């Protein structure tokens, strides 16, 4: 017994999936590389006697 006027929208839709193929690539730490000291990750390789 409360009188009010209502406007109602009735949605109807649905999503389907057919192709069973999909790829995901995930990227992290993007801001640090620009922010931090970035330079040649010089892999010093053992032609000074240690092996």
């Amino acid at each position: 017994q409360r009188i009010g006027r209502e406007i109602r929208l009735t949605p109807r839709y649905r999503y389907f999936n057919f192709l069973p193929i999909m790829l995901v690539i995930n990227v992290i730490n993007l801001e640090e590389a620009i922010a931090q000291r970035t330079a040649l990750d010089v892999n010093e390789t053992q032609v000074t006697p240690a092996s």
């Binding site: 017994q1 409360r2 009188i3 009010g4």
Partner: protein, 51 residues
């Protein structure tokens, strides 16, 4: 002397509150209309005569 050791302190209060009732929820008293009507009659009376 009369106000020595006299303290005033607030304790409570009330509010004058009332509902708009845009949708109405209350009824209150009702009013009715009735007609009580009576009939009235016109007699006759004994006649007069001349010779």
């Amino acid at each position: 002397a009369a106000l020595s050791g006299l303290t005033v302190t607030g304790v409570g209060y009330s509010l004058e509150a009332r509902l708009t009732n845009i949708n109405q929820l209350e009824m209150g008293l009702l009013i009715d209309s009735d007609v009580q009507k009576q009939g009235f009659m016109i007699p006759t009376l004994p006649p007069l005569v001349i010779v």
